[PDB]
Design a protein around this ligand. Structure first.
Ligand SMILES: CCCCCCCCCCCCCCCCCC(=O)OCC(COC(=O)CCCCCCCCCCCCCCCCC)OC(=O)CCCCCCCCCCCCCCCCC
Ligand SMILES: CCCCCCCCCCCCCCCCCC(=O)OCC(COC(=O)CCCCCCCCCCCCCCCCC)OC(=O)CCCCCCCCCCCCCCCCC
Ligand code: HEA
Ligand code: HEA
Ligand SMILES: CCCCC/C=C\C/C=C\C/C=C\C/C=C\CCCC(=O)O[C@H](COC(=O)CCCCCCCCCCCCCCCCC)COP(=O)(O)OCCN
Ligand SMILES: CCCCCC/C=C\CCCCCCCCCC(=O)O[C@H](COC(=O)CCCCCCCCCCCCCCC)COP(=O)(O)OC[C@@H](O)CO
Ligand SMILES: CCCCCC/C=C\CCCCCCCCCC(=O)O[C@H](COC(=O)CCCCCCCCCCCCCCC)COP(=O)(O)OC[C@@H](O)CO
Ligand SMILES: CCCCCC/C=C\CCCCCCCCCC(=O)O[C@H](COC(=O)CCCCCCCCCCCCCCC)COP(=O)(O)OC[C@@H](O)CO
Ligand SMILES: CCCCCC/C=C\CCCCCCCCCC(=O)O[C@H](COC(=O)CCCCCCCCCCCCCCC)COP(=O)(O)OC[C@@H](O)CO
Ligand SMILES: CCCCCCCCCCO[C@@H]1O[C@H](CO)[C@@H](O[C@H]2O[C@H](CO)[C@@H](O)[C@H](O)[C@H]2O)[C@H](O)[C@H]1O
Ligand SMILES: CCCCCCCCCCO[C@@H]1O[C@H](CO)[C@@H](O[C@H]2O[C@H](CO)[C@@H](O)[C@H](O)[C@H]2O)[C@H](O)[C@H]1O
Ligand SMILES: C[C@H](CCC(=O)O)[C@H]1CC[C@H]2[C@@H]3[C@H](O)C[C@@H]4C[C@H](O)CC[C@]4(C)[C@H]3C[C@H](O)[C@]12C
Ligand SMILES: C[C@H](CCC(=O)O)[C@H]1CC[C@H]2[C@@H]3[C@H](O)C[C@@H]4C[C@H](O)CC[C@]4(C)[C@H]3C[C@H](O)[C@]12C
Ligand code: CUA
Ligand SMILES: [Cu+2]
Ligand SMILES: [Mg+2]
Ligand code: NA
Ligand code: NA
Lengths: 79, 43, 259, 514, 58, 46, 227, 84, 79
């Protein structure tokens, strides 16, 4: 339960002004993880880091649109 | 540069005419539109 | 009279009718896109074709029939055609830039990958490879035509040029068929956009180039070219090699690397 | 004969005259637009009561001044009149294609007028960035008419560039190398190479905008995987070369004017002046992203573009100091053209220096999209191009027309203009430093004083424009026919008299090689 | 086919004062008038369309 | 052939300076007036 | 905010803005010097009856007027780039806030912990309370903690906008489909104003930005008060 | 960088005709065979109404506004899917 | 979820005769999964599928060398 989370830290994978891919990657990372953790022996609490980062970084409308498209079956990223 | 004397010299009176006519041709139409701006904005 | 070798051109109406044709085509496109009507566009296309036909007819009259293309005049036309081709290269460069910009940094809407999710590219080893062999082969045949002309051989110039034109037509019909069979469309995001606008402008240049070669074919049938003076043929060959090189860049970039 | 001569022309001088007439008329349109801008801002609040219309006025002002006033006057008008005379050629290489470059411009201008009359106009900025310029935020025909206006102007200038390059390379006397051709002819050649390479990229970019608006492409639309910033790159890859295109023929005329009225046979440091123009033209293609320092680019890219941009000051400074070194030791003739050229050197220098301020991407964060940029380019471009154009017009009017101007009147006109443009644009530096955005129809109250002064300045320059029309009338009205001019041994364009015959150099000059 | 270029050279060099775009004979005039009529008429039509499109159409 | 010389190499006449003044006034005045009338047109449209 | 008859930059509210002020002072001194030297030399060339009209040799003097401008450009570029690389270096923020541009207002999202968001509109002139600023106030200000490094993420839900606050040295374009980052650090409490800085249509002039900087404990109370 | 061929001495029409018939047109013949073996229709894929595809921001200026210019019903679905 | 694991199924990511990267990827995946699970609230049994696949495909000496290098701190893949 390692937290003390304030906001998303600097990520050397995404060091420049354009942070779009950082939001996208953590959104994928969280949802890939949350799917994996529905296998036998899994709890979504392990996915929490990705969840906090994407929620911190991603515009609400991006999250909402992506969620809608995952439910429609039209999300274009691989989960 | 050197030049022949004016074939058709333009007196100061003639210049004042041409200048006034020139200035009026710029100022009057624009003046009319700008004066009536409020007559336009209300339509 | 003059004692220089340059061409003082008779006053001509075709610049004005060309410029008006441009007004009619562009206002015609506007009316097509926004006011559901093809009328102006059809007039403009017609006057454009009329303008080109009469203007280049007059250039033939001035040169083959009146003798105004001295070597100095020809040299000028060589520069003019090279410069025109350079401007056309830069035009295509803008479309390649758009292609690499989109494909090297695919956005999340695409799936963050290239080709985008949902896009199923043509196999570059099928019709695209055939098209490549077609245009490469027509670069060989037009070079045979050029040498035959220089060597004074009318029959083989006409055969080689006929083969060149036939290959250009084959490319065009193959590309028309591929457009119809393609499972993706110009409205299929930036993949479809870059694919069809870039290959579409190229296809337009193939049709332009083929038409130019057909003009040369008929002028050759009419004995206009000498074994030494035939700049319309040289310009059409330069333009044809340009069309072949653009295709190679399209093939490697969009069809092959981008697949 | 009237239609044959003026609609079917194949004559470089007559086509040059058409361009000067067209450009002057466009200058009146663009001036009127600039006064509407300054009227809207001349006191706080709203004048037009319609900020979309304001934005349409700003957009049109820029397109008219750049594409219909400066480039037609400099390249179409002075270029066509002077280039063949300065190399002793009997016309341009493609005299008939030349006439089409001219006649494409009235339709281009008509398409711009149509843009502003249909729907609510194209209130986009002359940059026409999507998505503001796309089919949702600018639905309807206005932006498409603007795009087509630019296509026609682009074809005009690309073909004119082909013509000028071919003419200049191919139609000099056989003994004259490129390093024996006058600097104005160099300036046109280099301007033409910049047009040849840059305009097709603009054409590609606005064509992609056209298809995003009408054929459901998504080059610039993120929903399809496109990117608005790609449009900016394509636009500015053309647009930075464009600003050097707008000044380079001016640099060429300034060299000739400063040389002439310093009583010199030649400009100081000729090969340096050629080097500097070629260097500016080359560097002008590798700096465009300094128009994009706030879009989110990586720091190393911002560092490269800062550095590359500043390097252009080096060749430019060679030209400035060389003009000064041409004045050096002259028998100075204080003609009105000389006044324009001296005002050019100083005001162009001020504007270039605020360009170097802006090149520093750190400071450009705070200055981008503010009136500091507006002040920069109205010095270096607006005053730069206008003063070189006025200096060239006053200097060569007697050649083109056969008649002299009243020099006292011309000096008065210069004086009024110099006051007016400086009152208009110098306070805009303060507005920019203090944070007033550009492209605004109204401003926070703090900014009132300098906007008021700037708008008052714009009326002084209006008085100058009106006076210029009167002065041209007075010259044609009085008909003082030119006899002789000095320095014809180093100014070949004068040696066939004023105006030169319709056909000149039918017998070419004799130049031997030795 | 036979080489008839010399006969066209004689035609287009005839000293009749005609500009090259009319020197082929009466067909040139026809094609010119067609072209110019289409251009000037289309331009008039395009101005009509501007007028129509400049005002809201109910 | 065409006329040559001062006042003959232009598409407008300078034979009479007052007719000229009318022509130049219509010419430059029309271009200067046009933006004011287009603005009026847009303000009046609705 | 700007004040009447202002000639220069707004007073710096962040360290980076102070750096820019010093860098601008340095560069403007050079601009003034070169402009004034050119003007002087023009007058020097024009004020003598002495003449020299024969060909002049240019090589020697052109070394001077390429080497010296080159040196001057380097003396501008070195502090210019130093500040550039300072702005970019890792700042480890304690808070991320997003702003989304719209036609014509801004919205703000504080989604580190709670999912807070709200819209921020210009106060019309007719509704200004007495003493408030025409075209600059908003109904909902961007409350933020002072003396802390804040990550601002900027985008747009329609056309281009640009999020700017001159006294903090900030201007970041708001582009749909793109999330641009900038860092914000106020040395002082107070109210800091800015204006949309990329033309976005009709009301570009009328969608301002107002930051409200307060001590952390007050920021937390305000955050806390939103659930 | 000159292939494995090898025949100059004074280039000419005969050599370029030899290349045309001996290399270029045989290549076209072979690619034409290759192509007209791998011809025949593939399974069209399930329709998924992805929002980055089948873009419609303005109706097309032909037909019903919703068909692309070279629409092929067998392989081009509309925004709502394949046609009947 | 569907045990009676028999052997590693066909994987369209690795359809060709060289299966080196298939072994490598599943080895990475398993150990990445295992790292993730050992901290946050969860257990390695959700990693089991990757474990079975890499054990089926990877030569014993490869696994042994890679395990030694992880212990040594010289494993060049990212875990
Ligand atoms: C050689 C010596 C000369 C050298 C000096 C050159 C002259 C410089 C000073 C000039 C001093 C002389 C002024 C002469 C007045 C001429 C009469 C009856 C006639 C009335 C004229 C009014 C009609 C005016 C035309 C409309 C054929 C000529 C073509 C001229 C260019 C057309 C300009 C506008 C076309 C664009 C239309 C789209 C509107 C689009 C609007 C968009 C908003
Ligand atoms: C022909 C006339 C037409 C009429 C229209 C105007 C024309 C322009 C002429 C005006 C004559 C200009 C003389 C220098 C102007 C600097 C004013 C200033 O105080 O600037 C201050 C700074 C920012 O400064 C600050 O942060 C603090 C401000 C307060 C300092 C503390 C004192 C408090 C009281 C200040 C009282 C005033 C101080 C002025 C002190 C005055 C010192 C000279 O603003 C700026 O950077 C603005 C600079 C824009 C960049 C262009 C620089 C190149 C111009 C050099 C030649 C002039 C060309 C003129 C253009 C051409 C002119 C011939
Ligand atoms: C005539 C047109 C013209 C010219 C020649 C220039 C010349 C320069 N311009 Fe400018 N510029 C414009 C027209 C022009 N510009 C326009 C229209 C825009 C805005 C477009 C828009 O957004 O609408 C603009 C915008 C613009 C920007 C973008 C600002 C922004 O939007 O945020 C930048 C940034 O670097 C810039 C820099 C320069 C520089 C460094 C030069 C240099 O080439 C200047 C070099 C000259 C000198 C330096 C003076 C003489 C030199 C000496 C006396 C030597 C000694 C000097 C030194 C050592 C410094 N310009
Ligand atoms: C050659 C180019 C040129 C010229 C000559 C001018 C001349 C003038 N310009 Fe223009 N201007 C632009 C190019 C030019 N401008 C451009 C490119 C923009 C940016 C557009 C955008 O943001 O999209 C612009 C924007 C611009 C603005 C900013 C609008 C905004 O940000 O909201 C203002 C405001 O005062 C202005 C005023 C003037 C004035 C008062 C004059 C003149 O009245 C000064 C006197 C000059 C003359 C009278 C010329 C006469 C010559 C023959 C008649 N101009
Ligand atoms: C057969 C080989 C290819 C030959 C060329 C085919 C036609 C192209 C004609 C001109 C091409 C130039 C413009 C390219 C514009 C887009 C056309 C792209 C090529 C094409 O034809 O694309 C087609 C779409 O055409 C469409 O939208 C409709 C296109 C018709 C309207 C075009 C209007 C735009 C014209 C703008 C011109 C600007 C020119 C500026 C020049 C300036 C120079 C400085 C693709 O069909 P699809 O059904 O979507 O997918 C196929 C699925 N089975
Ligand atoms: C009460 C109204 C006051 C008007 C103020 C106008 C201000 C200045 C006018 C003086 C400017 C004269 C400039 C030309 C001098 C020509 C010198 C020359 O060198 O001409 C000789 C030969 C001499 C020609 C002199 C012509 C003077 C013309 C006057 C023009 C009209 C201005 C008035 C406007 C209308 C009321 C060659
Ligand atoms: C002389 C060589 C100097 C180096 C500059 C050009 C190199 C381009 C390589 C791009 C490769 C990736 C580099 C990534 C760097 C930032 C990311 C990515 C986008 O990449 C993109 O499309 C980039 C698209 C191209 C941008 C510049 C293009 C200019 C094109 C016209 C030039 C004239 C060409 C004449 C051709 C005959 C984001
Ligand atoms: C289905 C139809 C589609 C229509 C769309 C456009 C259509 C077709 C255009 C095809 C181009 C045809 C050009 C024909 C030119 C014929 C005139 C010509 O070739 O003229 C030759 C001169 O060349 C010259 O001007 C050289 C002239 C250069 C012509 C260059 C043409 C390129 C045109 C591109 C236009 C579109 C641009 C792209 C759009 C994005 C004449 O000189 P010679 O040959 O030496 O003869 C003299 C000897 O006989 C003496 O012994
Ligand atoms: C959205 C829709 C937009 C539509 C815009 C439409 C615009 C224009 C309408 C165009 C109509 C063209 C009519 C035919 C023009 C033929 C020009 C030509 O062929 O010009 C030749 C010179 O250019 C040369 O060679 C080399 C150059 C040949 C140029 C051929 C024409 C190209 C026109 C389009 C160019 C676009 C630029 C493409 C790159 C982006 C000959 O020059 P002349 O001065 O005539 O004669 C000289 C005599 O000595 C000949 O005996
Ligand atoms: C940005 C460039 C603009 C520069 C400013 C122009 C300077 C002024 C020029 C004069 O314009 C005239 O002004 C009159 C007012 O003095 C107007 O008459 C109007 O006002 C009169 C007095 O109230 C009535 O008699 C008229 O009928 C009524 O049309 C008239 O229309 C207008 O032509
Ligand atoms: C050069 C300026 C041209 C700009 C053209 C702008 C586009 C105009 C096409 C509009 O034409 C009109 O459209 C209406 C609706 O379809 C018709 O009912 C009407 O009869 C037609 O005339
Ligand atoms: C009629 C003409 C004879 C040459 C001449 O007139 O002297 C001959 C020579 C070469 C012939 C052409 C070339 O052999 C190429 C083509 C051969 C095709 O099989 C028929 C058309 C084709 C285009 C031929 C038509 C015609 O028979 C041509 C043009
Ligand atoms: C070598 C060339 C042409 C000389 C000639 O043939 O007349 C001259 C013309 C302009 C010269 C350049 C300019 O004078 C500007 C620079 C001046 C420096 O003193 C040397 C490098 C410098 C970059 C020069 C190098 C070289 O001497 C140039 C390029
Ligand atoms: Cu939002 Cu400008
Ligand atoms: Cu630039
Ligand atoms: Mg901006
Ligand atoms: Na040849
Ligand atoms: Na206002």
């Amino acid at each position: 339960k390692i937290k003390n989370y304030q906001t998303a830290p600097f990520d050397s994978r995404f060091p420049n002004q354009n942070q779009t891919r950082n939001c996208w990657q953590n959104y994928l990372d969280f949802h890939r993880c949350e799917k994996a953790m529905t296998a036998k022996g899994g709890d979504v609490s392990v996915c929490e880091w990705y969840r906090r980062v994407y929620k911190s970084l991603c515009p609400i409308s991006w999250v909402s649109t992506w969620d809608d498209r995952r439910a429609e079956g039209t999300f274009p990223g691989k989960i | 540069i050197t030049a022949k004397p004016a074939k058709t010299p333009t007196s100061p009176k003639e210049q004042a005419i041409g200048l006034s006519v020139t200035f009026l041709s710029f100022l009057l139409p624009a003046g009319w539109v700008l004066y009536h701006l409020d007559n336009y904005k209300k339509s | 009279h003059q004692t220089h070798a340059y061409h003082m051109v008779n006053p001509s109406p075709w610049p004005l009718t060309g410029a008006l044709s441009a007004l009619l085509m562009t206002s015609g496109l506007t009316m097509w896109f926004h006011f559901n009507s093809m009328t102006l566009l059809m007039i403009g296309l017609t006057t454009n074709m009329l303008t080109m036909y009469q203007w280049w007819r007059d250039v033939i009259r001035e040169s083959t029939f009146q003798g105004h293309h001295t070597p100095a005049v020809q040299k000028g036309l060589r520069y003019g055609m090279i410069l025109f081709i350079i401007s056309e290269v830069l035009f295509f460069t803008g479309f390649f830039w758009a292609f690499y910009h989109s494909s090297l940094a695919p956005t999340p809407e695409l799936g963050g990958c290239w080709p985008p999710t949902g896009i199923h590219p043509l196999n570059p080893l099928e019709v695209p490879l055939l098209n490549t062999s077609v245009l490469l082969a027509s670069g060989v045949s037009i070079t045979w035509a050029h040498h035959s002309l220089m060597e004074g051989d009318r029959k083989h110039m006409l055969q080689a040029l006929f083969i060149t034109i036939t290959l250009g037509v084959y490319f065009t019909l193959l590309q028309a068929s591929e457009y119809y069979e393609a499972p993706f469309t110009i409205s299929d995001g930036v993949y479809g956009s870059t694919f069809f606008v870039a290959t579409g402008f190229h296809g337009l240049h193939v049709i332009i180039g083929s038409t130019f070669l057909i003009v040369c074919f008929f002028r050759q049938l009419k004995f206009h070219f000498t074994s030494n003076h035939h700049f319309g043929f040289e310009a059409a060959a330069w333009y044809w090699h340009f069309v072949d090189v653009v295709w190679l860049f399209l093939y490697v970039s969009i069809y092959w690397w981008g697949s | 004969m009237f239609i044959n001569r003026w609609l079917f022309s194949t004559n470089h001088k007559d086509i040059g005259t058409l361009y000067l007439l067209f450009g002057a008329w466009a200058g009146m349109v663009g001036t009127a637009l600039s006064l509407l801008i300054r009227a809207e801002l001349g006191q706080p609040g709203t004048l037009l009561g319609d900020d979309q219309i304001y934005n349409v006025v700003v957009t049109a002002h820029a397109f008219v001044m750049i594409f219909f006033m400066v480039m037609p006057i400099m390249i179409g008008g002075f270029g066509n009149w002077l280039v063949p005379l300065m190399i002793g050629a009997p016309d341009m290489a493609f005299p008939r294609m030349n006439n089409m470059s001219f006649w494409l411009l009235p339709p281009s201008f008509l398409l711009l007028l149509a843009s502003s009359m249909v729907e609510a106009g194209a209130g986009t900025g002359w940059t026409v960035y999507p998505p503001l310029a796309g089919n949702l935020a600018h639905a309807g025909a206005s932006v498409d008419l603007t795009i087509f206006s630019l296509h026609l102007a682009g074809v005009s200038s690309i073909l004119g560039a082909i013509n000028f390059i071919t003419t200049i390379i191919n139609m000099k006397p056989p003994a004259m190398s490129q390093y024996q051709t006058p600097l104005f002819v160099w300036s046109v050649m280099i301007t033409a190479v910049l047009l040849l390479l840059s305009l097709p990229v603009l054409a590609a970019g606005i064509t992609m905008l056209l298809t995003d608006r009408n054929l459901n492409t998504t080059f610039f639309d993120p929903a399809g995987g496109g990117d608005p910033i790609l449009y900016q790159h394509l636009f500015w890859f053309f647009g930075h070369p464009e600003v050097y295109i707008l000044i380079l023929p001016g640099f060429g005329m300034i060299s000739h004017i400063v040389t002439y009225y310093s009583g010199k046979k030649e400009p100081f440091g000729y090969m340096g002046m050629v080097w500097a123009m070629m260097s500016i033209g080359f560097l002008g293609f590798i700096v465009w992203a300094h128009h994009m320092f706030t879009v989110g680019m990586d720091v190393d890219t911002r560092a490269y573009f800062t550095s590359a941009t500043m390097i252009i000051a080096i060749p430019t400074g060679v030209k400035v100091f060389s003009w000064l070194a041409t004045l050096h030791g002259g028998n100075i003739k204080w003609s009105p053209a000389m006044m324009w050229a001296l005002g050019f050197i100083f005001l162009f220098t001020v504007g270039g220096l605020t360009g170097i301020v802006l090149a520093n991407s750190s400071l450009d964060i705070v200055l981008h999209d503010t009136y500091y940029v507006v002040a920069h380019f109205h010095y270096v471009l607006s005053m730069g191009a206008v003063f070189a154009i006025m200096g060239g017009f006053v200097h060569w009017f007697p050649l083109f027309s056969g008649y002299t101007l009243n020099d006292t009147w011309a000096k008065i006109h210069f004086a009024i203009m110099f006051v007016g443009v400086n009152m208009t644009f110098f306070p805009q530096h303060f507005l920019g430093l203090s944070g007033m955005p550009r492209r605004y129809s109204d401003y926070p109250d703090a900014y009132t004083m300098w906007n008021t002064i700037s708008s008052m300045g714009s009326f002084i320059s209006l008085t100058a424009v009106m006076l210029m029309v009167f002065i041209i009338w007075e010259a044609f009205a009085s008909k003082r026919e030119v006899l002789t001019v000095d320095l014809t041994t180093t100014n070949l364009e004068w040696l066939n008299g004023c105006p030169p015959p319709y056909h000149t150099f039918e017998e070419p000059t004799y130049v031997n090689l030795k | 086919f036979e080489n008839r270029v010399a006969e066209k050279q004689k035609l287009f060099q005839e000293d009749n004062g005609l500009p090259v775009h009319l020197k082929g004979g009466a067909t040139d005039n026809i094609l010119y008038r067609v072209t110019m009529t289409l251009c000037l008429g289309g331009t008039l039509y395009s101005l009509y369309c501007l007028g129509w499109a400049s005002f809201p159409h109910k | 052939h065409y006329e040559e010389g001062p006042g003959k190499n232009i598409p407008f006449s300078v034979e009479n300076k007052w007719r000229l003044l009318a022509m130049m006034t219509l010419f430059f005045g029309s271009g200067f007036a046009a933006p004011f009338f287009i603005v009026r047109h847009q303000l009046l449209k609705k | 905010m700007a004040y009447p008859m202002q000639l220069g930059f707004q007073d710096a509210t962040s360290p980076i803005m102070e750096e820019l002020l010093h860098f601008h002072d340095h560069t403007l001194m050079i601009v003034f010097l070169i402009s004034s030297l050119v003007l002087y030399i023009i007058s020097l060339m024009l004020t003598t009856k002495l003449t020299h009209t024969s060909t002049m040799d240019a090589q020697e003097v052109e070394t001077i007027w390429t080497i010296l401008p080159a040196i001057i450009l380097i003396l501008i570029a070195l502090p210019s780039l130093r500040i550039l690389y300072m702005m970019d270096e890792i700042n480890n923020p304690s808070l991320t806030v997003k702003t989304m541009g719209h036609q014509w207002y801004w919205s703000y999202e504080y989604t580190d912990y709670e999912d807070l968001s709200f819209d921020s509109y210009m106060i019309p002139t007719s509704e200004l309370k007495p003493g408030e600023l025409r075209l600059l106030e908003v109904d909902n200000r961007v409350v933020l903690p002072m003396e802390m490094t804040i990550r601002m993420l900027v985008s747009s839900e329609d056309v281009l906008h640009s999020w700017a606050v001159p006294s903090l040295g900030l201007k970041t374009d708001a582009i749909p489909g793109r999330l641009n980052q900038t860092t914000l650090m106020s040395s002082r409490p107070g109210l800091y104003y800015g204006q949309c800085s990329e033309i976005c249509g009709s009301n570009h002039s009328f969608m301002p930005i107002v930051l409200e900087l307060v001590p952390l404990k007050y920021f937390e109370k305000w955050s806390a008060s939103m659930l | 960088a000159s292939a494995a061929k090898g025949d100059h001495g004074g280039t000419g029409a005969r050599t370029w005709r030899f290349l045309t018939f001996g290399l270029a047109l045989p290549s076209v013949a072979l690619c034409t065979l290759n192509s007209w073996l791998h011809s025949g229709h593939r399974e069209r894929p399930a329709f998924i109404p992805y929002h980055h595809l089948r873009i419609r921001t303005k109706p097309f200026s032909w037909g019903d506004g919703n068909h692309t210019f070279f629409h092929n019903p067998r392989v081009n679905p509309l925004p709502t899917g394949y046609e009947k």
